[PDB]
Design a binder for these strands. Sequence first.
RNA 1: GGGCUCUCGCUUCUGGCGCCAAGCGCCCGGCCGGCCGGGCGCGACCCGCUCCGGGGACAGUGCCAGGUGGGGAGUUUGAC
Length: 47
Amino acid sequence: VVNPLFEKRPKNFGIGQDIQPKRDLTRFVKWPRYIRLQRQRAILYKR
RNA sequence: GGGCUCUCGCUUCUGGCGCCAAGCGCCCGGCCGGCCGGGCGCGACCCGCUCCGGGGACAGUGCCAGGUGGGGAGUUUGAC
Ligand SMILES: [Mg+2]
Ligand SMILES: [Mg+2]
């Protein structure tokens, strides 16, 4: 029944091994000046 | 099988290649147990409040006060 051709082909997201995937980067975004403002406004209000 | 600490998370003989996902699970869409065409998530751990670091309540900026200042400006440099 099974085809010998269907090999399972894992990828190595190691250092240098293979190129890395497009994962979520919201924490490091260069936000516009209005957003960065209102956020660190609320933070000052806390501090 | 259990507690504790640290490390790692897989690359050092060579002038090479390396993108646009494999696989699995779970869903169902048309046709007729089989065919054609679709979707999500694991695979690629979870949560957060400042992009990362270094300084830092001092440099610094604004206003007064003393000083220094032919680098520069203005003027003078007697009479018989
Ligand atoms: Mg002067
Ligand atoms: Mg004059």
